[PDB]
Structures are given as C-alpha cells and as structure tokens.
Amino acid sequence: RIRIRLKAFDHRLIDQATAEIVETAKRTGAQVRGPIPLPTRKERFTVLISPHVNKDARDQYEIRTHLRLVDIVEPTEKTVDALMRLDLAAGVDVQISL
Template sequence: MQSQKIRIRLKAFDYRLIDQSSMEIVETAKRTGAVVRGPVPLPTRIERFDVLRSPHVNKTSRDQFEIRTHLRLMDIMDPTDKTVDALMKLDLPAGVDVEIKL
C-alpha cells in the first residue's frame, strides 16, 4: 500500500511572510505526529516592467519596476486525521497563497 502524502505549495511577494507561514505549518504538523519534508525554496519568479517616464517624448528615459514571487514547497508524509484538522484550522497571513494537493 502506498503511503499518503499532502503537498503544500506556498506563494507570496514577501519572503518574511512565507517563511513565517511555512514554520507555522511545520510546527503544526510535527505537533500532531506527522513527518514533514521541507520547506524547499523553489526559484523566485521575477517579473520586470519598463515604463516610459514621460507621456510624450524622451523615449530613452524609463522607470523599471519588478515584482518577486517567492515559492516554498512542503510534503507532509502519512498525515493523521489530527494533522488534517489542525492544518485546516491554521490561520495564515493574508499575503500568502496556499495550494494543497492530497
């Protein structure tokens, strides 16, 4: 029989929020007796935008903006019912996107 696994993928713009959230998830899972693999930092996605400063002339003058998306991946091996309940009740910050696959 294959063991069960919960895969959690976190996504956020602020690395401090994502690290704090991943530590909360790891502590919760370990407290309920599950084995945690991770958090594994995935490559940061950097999106860059170039915008003209002037609305009319000066094409060579531009502003550059970037948005960084930080990702973390965690696997919870052999979760118990307690683990699933504790993870569902966990309150994470609003700036963190959580994807859970069973």
C-alpha cells in the same frame, strides 16, 4: 501524501506562514519531508517615465514571487486535521492540492 505550496511576495510573510506549518502542521503525526525554497519567478517590467516623448526615459519595476514547498509526507488524521486551523496571512497563496 498531501503536498502543500506557499507562494508569497516576500519572506516577511512567506516565513512565518511556512514555519507555522512545520511547527503546527508537523508535530508527531505528520511526517513532513522538509521545507524547500524552490526557484523564484522573477517578473520585471519597463515603463516609460515621462508622459509622451523622451524615449530615453523608461523605468524598471519587478515583482518577486517567493515560493516554498515543504509538504507533509504523512496522510494521517489527528495532525492532518490541524492545518485548516490556519488561514491568516494577508497574502500567502496556499495551494493545498494532492
């Protein structure tokens, strides 16, 4: 069964990008075991604000990497060949590995 992964930087895109699959990639052919959230990979960073001196400055940033699994649980042909018909999203890593 082909497994699909979606890792965006927020739900503003990871949402539609995923619902698309469940809607399109999942009609009757594909089985789809279900859309899961999975733990988010939080990576923050601390940067010295002031240019030179003032150690007590610093500023904290962070980039939440939102992910989703779902994955189709049915390797057919009529429905498993209607996903490629989706490559939009200006930022939604879709690692379609098996």
